[PDB]
Ligand binder design. Sequence first.
Ligand SMILES: O=C(O)c1ccc2ccccc2c1-c1c(C(=O)O)ccc2ccccc12
Lengths: 134, 132, 445, 444
Amino acid sequence: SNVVLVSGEGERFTVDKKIAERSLLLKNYEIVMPVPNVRSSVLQKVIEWAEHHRDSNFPDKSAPVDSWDREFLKVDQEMLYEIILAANYLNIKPLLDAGCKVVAEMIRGRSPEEIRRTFNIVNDFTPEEEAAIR
Amino acid sequence: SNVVLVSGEGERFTVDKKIAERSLLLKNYLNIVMPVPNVRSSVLQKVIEWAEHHRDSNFPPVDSWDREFLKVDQEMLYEIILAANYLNIKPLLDAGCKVVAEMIRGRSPEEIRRTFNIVNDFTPEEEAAIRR
Amino acid sequence: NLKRDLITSLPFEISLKIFNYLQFEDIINSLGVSQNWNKIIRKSTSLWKKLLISENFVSPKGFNSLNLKLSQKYPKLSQQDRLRLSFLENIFILKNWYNPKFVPQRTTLRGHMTSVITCLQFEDNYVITGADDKMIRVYDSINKKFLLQLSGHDGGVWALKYAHGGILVSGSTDRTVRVWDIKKGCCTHVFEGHNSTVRCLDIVEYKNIKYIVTGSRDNTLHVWKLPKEYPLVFHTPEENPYFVGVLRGHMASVRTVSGHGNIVVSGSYDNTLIVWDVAQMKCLYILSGHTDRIYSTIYDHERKRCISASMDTTIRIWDLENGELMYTLQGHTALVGLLRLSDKFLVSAAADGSIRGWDANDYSRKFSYHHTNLSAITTFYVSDNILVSGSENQFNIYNLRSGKLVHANILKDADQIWSVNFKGKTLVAAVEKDGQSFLEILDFS
Amino acid sequence: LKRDLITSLPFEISLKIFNYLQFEDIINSLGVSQNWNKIIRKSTSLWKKLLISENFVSPKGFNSLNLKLSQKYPKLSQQDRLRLSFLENIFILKNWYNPKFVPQRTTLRGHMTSVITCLQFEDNYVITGADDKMIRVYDSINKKFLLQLSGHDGGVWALKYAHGGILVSGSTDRTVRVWDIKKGCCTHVFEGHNSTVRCLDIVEYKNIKYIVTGSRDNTLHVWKLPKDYPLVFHTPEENPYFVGVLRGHMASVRTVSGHGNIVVSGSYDNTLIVWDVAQMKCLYILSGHTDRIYSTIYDHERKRCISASMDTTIRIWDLENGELMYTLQGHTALVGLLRLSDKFLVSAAADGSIRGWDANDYSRKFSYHHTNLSAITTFYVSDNILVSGSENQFNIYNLRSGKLVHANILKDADQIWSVNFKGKTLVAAVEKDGQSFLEILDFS
Ligand SMILES: O=C(O)c1ccc2ccccc2c1-c1c(C(=O)O)ccc2ccccc12
């Protein structure tokens, strides 16, 4: 018993109904649900997470990220970003959680410059808002 | 749940919404940030100190923590009455008016004048007609 | 320095708030503070209103009448300034009423042929008395003089009601109802129709028409129009254009009546009060439960209540929305005499030389005063400020705010006090000396 | 290339990222950008979860800490207030927790006598009382003696501070005095009490305040705290402020605890009674102990009562219905002092033991022994710190790690009569060589 999920780049993904039901948006109510504005390469990776986790339960500091979830999320930041987006859109809370934990792992321990370099963000503090420091 | 009241000097005062509602203008308004034109910060802060202290008061006679609170110079008192009036907080306005009245009670016209720095501007005629 | 004329500086209304927290003594002082305080204080009608009310010189539902009388007395003055002079005058007069050192001016005028006065009216500078000698005597209360005797009744006068314009209505054992003009000095109209003594009477005004309601020992009341435009005699009510109809319901003598507008309440020796609509000529309610004769009633129109006093020794307050009994007041000693309702107090005398006062709204206990002699009360008159009371050899005046006898001394030489009435500076008494009647006018200017 | 994930993601998600980090990493993040800094301070939850998780306030205590910060930082926003308060708190806690940090010490003269019998610390006042009949008032901000309140005709043995600089005292003269500190004098004397007043409390309820007064005379007295100046009432039936007497215990009332209209007392007669001061009515008889009751706490939050005996146990009772839930074992000696913080029931026995139990289920959370095994004379606790004193020993314990933080800050005391702390201020009434002193310690 399958379902098909169409990504935003127009590719069809066939996956098992119960595995797709990991998505609550999916769950809620042959059968072909669209995934608007979600790069086919992104939805792939979601489905991959979902199949890997077919027999995982999760709860409702926190449960640290699964050793597998950590590799599967060792990606470039734009993939990281769209996946977090995707799990938000699809309401796959355990995935949004993991995603967020990894981003937090990027900030952890770092300094302000360190951080900025880590995301290519622009320091737009005035000399006087800069030096304001506690 | 909070609300911001902006004083005539541009200073933003965060206050609990339930608490600020003591002002019926604010309660009325209407409908996160409410201007309070022409009310100095120190005066607004005084008002909010009153509203926060009376948070659990039932208003429907005289007053007591309000007496230290209203024991200020005349400029301040005046200004607090204006702000109470503007903001529609009857029990505070009522309280400030009572305080003004306490200044006048049992005092002669000579003393009332000296208290408020008022010039006696009756003609000797106006005044003869006054004592009867 | 950091000093500011707050009254001046503040919005006008905020300044009146402030001034309305003050005693009037402080307000008089404030008037003398400066032109601007003077103007401010003198601008406010409602400041002076409140003052007049807080000193009980007048009531909310009495005020338009006072305003009118002032515009008449002082036409060149503003409402505010009228109220203020009225306030200042009343305080002066009251201060005198309150001061045990003050001695009023006493005037004595020959009373009636018989030594017992039965009724007394004090209105518009007129004092009117009736008695067992078949005569009504009209006196002038400013100039303090006897104006004139009105004769013609064939029996004793049991009741009289003055109506605006020098008009008088009396009722007599001769079973007539008579209407008088004082200025002209004669009986204008005789209304026959009662089959027995006219015992009591009232005058009511409804939709701008004035009516005489008369109660009789014949069991009935009769309603007549007060004539507007000598004596014209009407032997037949049927053919009398001023005759409205008869009110039948009581099974015995009608002792007492009290009306306002189209509502009239009577009490009877049948132990009952009837409430009547006088425009429909119908009974509204029978009020049952007293167990002996009723001798006094007040229809309380402000509050829509009836107050009755009975030989059974109780007072009852009845609710005129539903004809229901509200309250029974008692007891231990009988009540006597006529009841009075001031704006603050229901007051009655009692069979033990006392006067009692209850709050006029919820009838809680408010005052008792006692003639030290255990002397049967014959008469008292009251207002929110003053109680005046008489009995044998005794004429007392009390300050109802402080609860103290203010004057015990004033009419000592008089043996009996039959009737007493007062308004502002004037106080009048129908009295007996050495087996003879007099009228006493006491003036507290 | 890369992305500014924080800015790009919906507010709610970036927030959820921030809730995963430690406070350090969140400050750091404030110094990254106008938008980062913005996002982070738009956030009330962030800082609320932070105060809570370091135990600087409890879900229930929140609104009240909020109003206090409002009363103190009127011109700040809720967020910035919270941030300030967290950052002030984390810096003080680091100090308290730091083995290499030593606090400033101010030693002040105490009472004419070496034993101090009671201590209140509230509103920047330290108030102590002793056998010498006196009450002493100290300023905790400037670390100074303010004034002495005298009047009592005998030892002072119970104090309670009331908001507004008012204090209430119990004594051997059997008076109940009320003082105004800001005026420096006694305002009301409440006689009526046929022995010493050993204990006392103040409660509030339908916005009037009352004083409950407990006695070596078996009964309690209920008065109302008032609204030329030594204004005395010899006569209880003719004293306006006296409500009633609450008769029950057949022995001395050693200890009392209440709020609102519920007061609970524990007696030398081995029982406790639960009272309703509104109706002046006895509610339950907590009976089961086999020796003196030395302490009790009315846990209003959970509608429970805790009792500490000379019989050596502790007992928890359900105040909705009045039966025993648990008997605790942990003291092979009379449990003397009792405290309840948000997370811990802490008790302290005279074998030198101090033990801590979960405030909810009462499972064992910690035990500490003064090395010399002498009687624990006083202790004070929060969720984060334990300060306990005994003869020759003054100890600060870090409750997260269970390690002794300092052992000798008050090395030179021979006795710690009484200890109390708040924020950056530790205060102790101590004895040195026959004289008593007030010790104040500053962790800012
Ligand atoms: O009952 C009494 O003896 C009593 C006592 C004090 C009072 C004071 C003011 C007015 C009435 C008072 C009364 C009283 C009440 C009554 O209590 O309303 C009702 C009827 C009364 C009749 C006669 C005398 C006193 C009466």
